[PDB]
């Protein structure tokens, strides 16, 4: 509308989707890393024996 | 009859830009003419 109210509202969407963009982000670069442990514990029987 | 003559004026307003805005979406009063009182408010306790 023109309207100051509506920058702010407009403004407050991109400062979640962003901040929602940067968790996806951040979630595969979490996540390969919680893969990298999965295929060595399929291997690696214990030391004992 | 006085004439048939008249001089108006145009509008008014106030839109919400110096600290309305801080008063609104932090605090939940939003005071008409903020400055001007807030400005005084700022001189009466010094007379």
Same mark, same amino acid.
């Given at each position: ?49 | ?7 108006? @004026? *145009?509008?008014?307003? /106030? ?5 309305? #805005? @801080? *008063?609104?979406?932090? /605090? ?5 003419? #903020? ?13």
């Amino acid at each position: 509308d023109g309207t100051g109210i509506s920058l702010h509202r407009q403004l407050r969407a991109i400062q979640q989707l962003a901040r929602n963009v940067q968790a996806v982000l951040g979630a595969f670069e979490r996540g390969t890393a919680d893969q990298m442990l999965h295929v060595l514990l399929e291997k690696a029987p214990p030391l004992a024996l | 009859e006085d004439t048939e003559a008249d001089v108006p @004026v *145009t509008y008014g307003e /106030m839109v919400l830009n110096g600290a309305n #805005l @801080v *008063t609104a979406l932090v /605090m939940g009063k939003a005071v008409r003419s #903020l400055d001007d009182v807030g400005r005084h408010l700022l001189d009466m306790q010094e007379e």
